[PDB]
Amino acid sequence: SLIVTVTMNPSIDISYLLDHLKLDTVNRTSQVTKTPGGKGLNVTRVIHDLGGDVIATGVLGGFHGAFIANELKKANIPQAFTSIKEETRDSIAILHEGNQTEILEAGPTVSPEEISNFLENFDQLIKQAEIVTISGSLAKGLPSDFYQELVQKAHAQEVKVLLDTSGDSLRQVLQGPWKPYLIKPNLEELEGLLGQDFSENPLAAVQTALTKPMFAGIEWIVISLGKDGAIAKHHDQFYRVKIPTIQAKNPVGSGDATIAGLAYGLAKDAPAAELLKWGMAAGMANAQERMTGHVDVENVKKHLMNIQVVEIAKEGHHH
C-alpha cells in the first residue's frame, strides 16, 4: 500500500570529510558529498531501500530545490513536491577528528498562497494513500500548529499518520483534537515534554508518563532508546523491545530509519511484535552504514530473527 512522506523543510545535505579543521584559515578537501536531506527524505530513502511503495511530498524552491528533485529522479524515487519561490536551504556537516560540527540555516519563507497550493496537492495525494509519515520541523511562514491540519485531512480519508516531530510543533498536536496513529519520541524528547529526568531502568516511569492525558487517543507510542532498543505502548498494552549489539558506523538518522520500518510494517498489516521488529531492524541497519538515510536490506532481514518483543504485565496481575 502507498506511503506518502512529508518534508516541510528539506535541504541539500553537504558533508565534508577533513582530518583537521583549522580555525581562521583555508581548509581544502575533495571529500565532499551533497545529498537530498532533511528527516523526511531520510525516511523516504529507507522505505525505498526496503522495497516499499513510497512517494515524497513537501515544498522545494529555486535551483537548490531543482537539484534535490533531479537527484530523486536519478534514484527513481517517486515525488510530488509543491513549488515555492524562495530557495531551499543547505545543511553543512563537517566531519573531523571524530566530531560532527554542523551549520544549519533558517531557510526559505513559505507564503500564504504557497501554503494553499501545498494543501490542495496534499488532499489529492492522501486520497491515494494508506499511510502518511510527517517528519521534522516547520519551514518559516507555516503556523506552529500546521501539523494539526495535516492530521485532520488524513482522518477524513482514514489514513494512518506516523508523526516524528518535537517542541512546539509536537505539543500543539498533543493539545489538539486530531491525534496521529503513531508517535516516536526519543527519551530526551520525552524528558523535555514532561520536564522529568529519567534514571537507569526508566521503564516504570515511562509507563506512568505515557498514561497521562497529554498522550490520550494515540494508538501507538514508540520510545526509542538507541542501542538499548525501545519501550512501546499499543492502547493499554506495554512492550519492552530488546535488540542485539552491533558495530555502528554512523547512527545519525537511525530515528528516521525506524519511522521508515514502522511505516513499511504497517503497510503490510504486520501484527504488533513484527511491526516493532521492522522498526528496530531498519534503525539498526542505518546505524551500520556510513552514509545517512540508507540501509542494506540483507542486514535488515538478519536483524528481524534476533529481536525479542516482551509483553509487560498489568498492575492487577495476581490481583
- Residues near a copy of itself (CB under 8 A): 14, 16, 18, 21-30, 32, 34, 62-64, 66-67, 70, 87, 90, 92, 94, 99-106
Is residue 226 within the footprint of ligand ATP (CB under 6 A)?
yes
CB atoms within 10 A of CB 260: 34
Given 85, 127, 140, 227, the residue binding ligand ATP (CB under 6 A) = 227
x-marked contacts with ligand ATP along 108-147 as a string, rule CB under 6 A: ----------------------------------------
Quote the cell numbers at residue 207.
509507563
x-marked contacts with ligand ATP along 62-91 as a string, rule CB under 6 A: ------------------------------
* Phi, psi values for residue 81, rounded to 5°: -70, 150
Least distance CB 15 / ligand ATP (angstroms): 15
The one-letter amino acid code at 45 reads R
Is residue 229 within the footprint of ligand ATP (CB under 6 A)?
yes
Least distance CB 108 / a copy of itself (angstroms): 11
Q: Residues, the chain, total? A: 319
User: Does residue 228 contact residue 251 with C-beta atoms inside 8 Å?
Assistant: no
CA distance 33 to 42: 15
CA distance 272 to 239: 10
Is residue 293 within the footprint of ligand ATP (CB under 6 A)?
no
Q: What is the H or E stretch that residue 224 is in?
A: strand 220-224
Rank residues 39 and 89 by Cβ distance to ligand ATP and give the closer one. 39
* Burial class (CB within 10 angstroms; exposed 0-12, middle 13-18, buried 19+) of 192: middle
Beta bridge partners of 13: 35, 91
CA distance 132 to 199: 34
Rank residues 18 and 205 by Cβ distance to a copy of itself and give the closer one. 18
Given 47, 56, 68, 284, the residue binding ligand ATP (CB under 6 A) = 284
Is residue 163 within the footprint of ligand ATP (CB under 6 A)?
no
Residues 258-277 that bind ligand ATP (CB under 6 A): 258
Least distance CB 112 / a copy of itself (angstroms): 21
Q: Which does 246 bind (CB under 5 to 8 A by kind): ligand ATP, a copy of itself, none?
A: ligand ATP
Q: Which does 283 bind (CB under 5 to 8 A by kind): a copy of itself, ligand ATP, none?
A: ligand ATP
Count of residues of this chain found to bind ligand ATP when the rule CB under 6 A is applied: 21
Beta bridge partners of 96: 99
User: Does residue 287 contact residue 35 with C-beta atoms inside 8 Å?
Assistant: no
Specify the stretch interacting with ligand ATP by CB under 6 A; choose among 2-10, 21-29, 117-125, 224-232: 224-232
Q: Tell the residue number behind the cell numbers 525516511, with chain if given.
A: 43
CB atoms within 10 A of CB 3: 26
CA angle 130, 135, 137 (to 5 degrees): 145
Specify the stretch interacting with ligand ATP by CB under 6 A; choose among 59-67, 75-83, 106-114, 226-234: 226-234
> String of b and e for 283-300 (b: at least 16 CB within 10 Å)?
bbbbbbbeebbbbeeebb
Least distance CB 46 / ligand ATP (angstroms): 11
- Residues that bind ligand ATP in the complex, under the rule CB under 6 A: 186, 224-227, 229-230, 243, 246, 248, 251-256, 258, 280, 283-284, 287
